[PDB]
């Protein structure tokens with residue numbers, strides 16, 4: 001009867017779980033992206049409306065019976081973005097508790113099931129977020145696909161295209177990415193990449209998918225692809241170092257986990273990142289996420305209920 005909503009506005013999808021107050025997940029719903037930095041406000045509003053309404057339709061209950069809603073989404077970086085997202089949910093007619101956080105905060109909650117720890121995201125975007133034993137939080141990275149997202153899938157896809165073009169026009173080292181990217185995208189020639197990137201409405205998720213090609217080429221022995229993966233791991237490590245030092249956790253026991261289909265999928269990248277952490281922070285323990293981010297959002301919403 002009573003339920004909560006938890007929404008993960010990740011870089012790959014929007015993922016909503018509806019749960020009872022004793023954490024029995026009743027249903028989940030998937031829609032497209034919800035980042036106001038890469039879609040119009042009307043586009044995002046529509047996504048969240050369609051997402052919530054499809055779940056309520058399966059649930060058979062109205063929104064005003066919902067005890068709390070938590071949404072962690074990419075693009076919720078500033079207090080001003082928090083209130084914009086809150087407004088698109090209130091516009092549905094909800095007057096209960098709404099908690100809007102960055103997608104890294106719900107990944108922390110789902111991954112560690114506590115408030116204290118470190119989370120690195122590398123999916124279509126990248127970010128590090130942490131909270132120390134004193135309850136103080138900090139973040140690094142997360143500045144988006146133009147002025148940030150170092151070590152994200154989007155960043156690896158752009159760098160893969162750049163390395164393939166430099167291989168083609170003779171400014172860089174030869175790499176099998178030169179032909180492999182064209183095969184993957186079903187393009188005849190490198191000039192076709194101009195239509196693909198600038199003319200066709202390409203999405204961040206589409207560019208980030210080229211991380212699959214880099215991983216494949218690394219397995220085939222390609223040195224350029226291997227160095228792209230290594231440098232992304234270093235960028236991700238730098239974001240942890242930044243948060244660890246800001247929160248004065250350099251020499252404290254810390255639990256760290258990771259989210260996103262780039263850091264969690266590519267063995268070499270994950271290994272290099274773990275190596276950097278192990279070199280620098282003896283007391284950081286690395287674990288896998290206990291639940292997913294949408295269940296983290298359920299934890300944050302339900303924890304606000306009596």
Ligand SMILES: CC(=O)N[C@@H]1[C@@H](O)[C@H](O)[C@@H](CO)O[C@H]1O
Nearest residue numbers: 037074075125126127142143144
């Ligand atoms: C769009 C922006 O400025 N920053 C987002 C950030 O909110 C998010 O935490 C991160 C990982 O999903 O992706 C970045 O692109």
